[PDB]
Amino acid sequence: TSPGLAQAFKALGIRGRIRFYTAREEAWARRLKEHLGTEWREYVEVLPLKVDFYHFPELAVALAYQRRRLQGAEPPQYLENAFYNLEDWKHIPDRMAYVYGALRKAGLTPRKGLKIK
Amino acid sequence: TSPGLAQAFKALGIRGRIRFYTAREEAWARRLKEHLGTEWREYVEVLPLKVDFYHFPELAVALAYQRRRLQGAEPPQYLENAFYNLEDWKHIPDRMAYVYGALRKAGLTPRKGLKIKYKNENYDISEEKSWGNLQEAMGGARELYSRAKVFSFLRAFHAPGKEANFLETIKEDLLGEKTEGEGKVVILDLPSLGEAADFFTLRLMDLLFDRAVELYGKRQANFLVVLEEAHNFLEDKAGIFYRVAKEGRKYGIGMLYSTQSPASIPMEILSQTENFLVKHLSSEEDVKVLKRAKAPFAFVADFLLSEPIIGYSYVYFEPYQPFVVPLRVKLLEHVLKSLDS
Amino acid sequence: ESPIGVVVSSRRNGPWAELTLVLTPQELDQGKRLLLGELVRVSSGGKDYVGMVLDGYYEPVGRSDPTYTLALAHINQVDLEKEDPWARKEVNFYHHRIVLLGRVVQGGLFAPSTRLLPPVVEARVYRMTEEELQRLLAAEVRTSGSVKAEGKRRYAFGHLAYGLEEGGEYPEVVKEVDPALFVGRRTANFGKTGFGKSNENKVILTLLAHAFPRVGMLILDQNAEYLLQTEATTSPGLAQAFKALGIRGRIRFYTAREEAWARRLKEHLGTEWREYVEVLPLKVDFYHFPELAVALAYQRRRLQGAEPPQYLENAFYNLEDWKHIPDRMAYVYGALRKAGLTPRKGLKIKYKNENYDISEEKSWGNLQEAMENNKGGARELYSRAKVFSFLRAFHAPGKEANFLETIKEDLLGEKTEGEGKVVILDLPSLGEAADFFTLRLMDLLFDRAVELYGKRQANFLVVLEEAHNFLEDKAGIFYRVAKEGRKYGIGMLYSTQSPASIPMEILSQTENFLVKHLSSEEDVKVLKRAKAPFAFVADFLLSEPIIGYSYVYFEPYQPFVVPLRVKLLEHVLKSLDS
DNA sequence: GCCCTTTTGCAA
DNA sequence: TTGCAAAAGGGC
* Protein footprint of strand D, defined by Cβ closer than 7 Å to any strand atom: A 77; C 305-306, 374, 379, 383
- Other CB atoms within a 10 A radius of the CB of residue C145 amount to 8
In angstroms, rounded to a whole number, what is the distance separating the alpha carbons of residues B183 and B173?
9
H-helix or E-strand spanning residue C368 = helix C361-372
- Other CB atoms within a 10 A radius of the CB of residue C232 amount to 8
Which long-range CB contacts under 8 A does B133-142 form with residues at least 24 apart?
A: B134/B97, B134/B101, B135/B101, B135/B105, B138/B98, B138/B101, B139/B94, B139/B95, B139/B98, B140/B81, B140/B82, B140/B85, B140/B89, B140/B95, B141/B82, B141/B89, B141/B94, B141/B95, B141/B96, B141/B98, B141/B99, B141/B102, B142/B98
Of B199, B216, B238, the CB nearest to A70: B238
Q: Where are the beta strands (DSSP E) in B83-237?
A: 116-117, 122-123, 185-188, 226-228
Nucleotide nearest to A77 (CA to C1'): D4
Report yes or no: B193 and B49 within 8 Å, Cβ to Cβ.
yes
Report yes or no: C385 and C290 within 8 Å, Cβ to Cβ.
no
By the 10 Å C-beta count (0-12 exposed, 13-18 middle, 19+ buried), C106 is classed as middle
- Other CB atoms within a 10 A radius of the CB of residue C202 amount to 20
In angstroms, rounded to a whole number, what is the distance separating the alpha carbons of residues C212 and C180?
8
Residue C221's closest CA among C136, C312, C282, C299? C282
Query: Which residues does B329 contact at the CB level (< 8 Å), separation at least 6?
Result: B277, B311, B313
Residue C286's closest CA among C206, C394, C436? C394
Please report, rounded to whole angstroms, the spatial distance between the CA atom of protein residue C109 and the C1' atom of nucleotide D12: 81
Of A24, A70, A74, the CB nearest to B217: A24
Q: Where on the phi/psi map is residue B13: left (φ > 0), alpha (ψ -120 to 50), or beta?
A: left
Report yes or no: C214 and C420 within 8 Å, Cβ to Cβ.
yes
Residue C530's closest CA among B299, B265, B281? B281
- Please report, for chain A, how many H helices and E strands are present, in that order: 5, 2
**Residue of chain B nearest A75, judged by CA positions:** B75
DSSP symbols for C80-108: TTTS-HHHHHHH--EEEEEEE-EEEETTT
Q: Which of residues 192-211 of C touch strand E (CB under 7 A)?
A: none
Please report, rounded to whole angstroms, the spatial distance between the CA atom of protein residue C476 and the C1' atom of nucleotide D2: 21
Please report, rounded to whole angstroms, the spatial distance between the CA atom of protein residue C432 and the C1' atom of nucleotide D1: 26
- Cβ separation of B146 and C317 shorter than 8 Å? yes
Residue C536, amino acid: F
Q: B71 to each of A74, B75, B126, C300, C402, how far by Cα in Å?
A: 14, 12, 38, 9, 22
Chain Cα centroid distance, residue B5: 18
Of A69, A72, A76, the CB nearest to B66: A72
Q: Burial code of C147-162, b = ≥16 C-beta within 10 A, e = fewer?
A: eeeeeeeebebbbbbb
Residue B137, amino acid: A
Inform me whether the C-beta atom of residue A28 falls under 8 Å from chain B C-beta atoms. yes
Question: What residues in B contact C556, CB-CB < 8 Å?
Answer: 308
- Sign of the dihedral through C-alpha C210, C213, C215, C221: positive
Q: Where are the beta strands (DSSP E) in C385-507?
A: 422-426, 460-465, 492-495
Q: How was this structure determined?
A: cryo-EM
Query: Which residues does C338 contact at the CB level (< 8 Å), separation at least 6?
Result: C382, C385, C386
∠ CA B181-B186-B191, nearest 5°, is: 170
**Residue of chain A nearest B62, judged by CA positions:** A72
The DSSP 8-state label assigned to residue B153 in this structure reads G
Question: What residues in B contact A20, CB-CB < 8 Å?
Answer: none
- Cβ separation of B238 and A76 shorter than 8 Å? no
In angstroms, rounded to a whole number, what is the distance separating the alpha carbons of residues C277 and B7?
52
The 3-state DSSP class for residue B278 equals: strand
In angstroms, rounded to a whole number, what is the distance separating the alpha carbons of residues C561 and A88?
64
In angstroms, rounded to a whole number, what is the distance separating the alpha carbons of residues C254 and C441?
13
Question: What residues in C contact B307, CB-CB < 8 Å?
Answer: 112-113
Report cis status (omega within 30 of 0) of the bond before B319: yes
Query: What are C52's strand-pairing partners?
Result: C39, C99
Report yes or no: C221 and C425 within 8 Å, Cβ to Cβ.
yes
Report cis status (omega within 30 of 0) of the bond before C556: yes
**Chain B neighbours among C 106-145 (CB < 8 Å)?**
111-113, 141-144
- Cβ separation of B202 and A28 shorter than 8 Å? no
Please tell me the distance in Å from B179's CA to the nearest CA on chain C: 34
Question: What residues in B contact A74, CB-CB < 8 Å?
Answer: 69, 73, 75
CA dihedral C507, C510, C513, C518 (to 10 degrees): -10
Report yes or no: C453 and B191 within 8 Å, Cβ to Cβ.
yes
Residue C127's closest CA among C218, C220, C43, C57? C43
Query: What are A44's strand-pairing partners?
Result: A18
Chain Cα centroid distance, residue C399: 33
DSSP symbols for C275-303: GTEEEEES-B-TTT-HHHHHHHHHHHHHH
H-helix or E-strand spanning residue B317 = strand B312-317
Q: In chain E, which nucleotides are within 7 Å of a protein Cβ?
A: 3-5
H-helix or E-strand spanning residue C161 = strand C155-161
CA dihedral B135, B136, B139, B142 (to 10 degrees): 50
Query: Which residues does C298 contact at the CB level (< 8 Å), separation at least 6?
Result: C308, C312, C313, C315, C316
**Residue pairs spanning A and B at CB distance below 8 A:** 26
